[PDB]
């Protein structure tokens, strides 16, 4: 909701578009735009 209000992802009546914001976040997570990695197991 905060990301939708910040980025203007609003529906009719100012309702936040959590659906579209979630799709944007998932696409950013897949396409190398948010840093994340799985740490290697220690020997």
């Amino acid at each position: 909701e905060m990301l939708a209000r910040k980025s203007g992802r609003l529906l009719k009546g100012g309702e936040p578009d959590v659906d579209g914001v979630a799709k944007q976040v998932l696409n950013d997570f897949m396409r190398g735009k948010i840093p994340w990695f799985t740490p290697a197991p220690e020997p």
């Binding site: 909701e1 009546g13 100012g14 309702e15 936040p16």
Partner: protein, 101 residues
Amino acid sequence: GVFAKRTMTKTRRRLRDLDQIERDLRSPRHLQQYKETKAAEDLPGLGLYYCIECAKWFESETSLVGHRKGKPHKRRLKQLKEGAYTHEEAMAAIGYRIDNG
């Protein structure tokens, strides 16, 4: 102008009635029931800016102060000053009354 004036009289496009507006103004419990029939996070301005007379939510306090200067808000004020039409007025129009003993 009115958005989608073709389907303006559909039941799914209905707006709150004036007698309900007077009852909300007179008693905060009726207004609280109407507000509990909604979801706060999906309202303009998180439900914080509400005009009871227009029965309408607004995105900001300056937007509410803005619509108050407009003529629709003044039409609602003059309609509330005249008084909305109720079943008591309907019975008085035909001379009918209720006998409770």
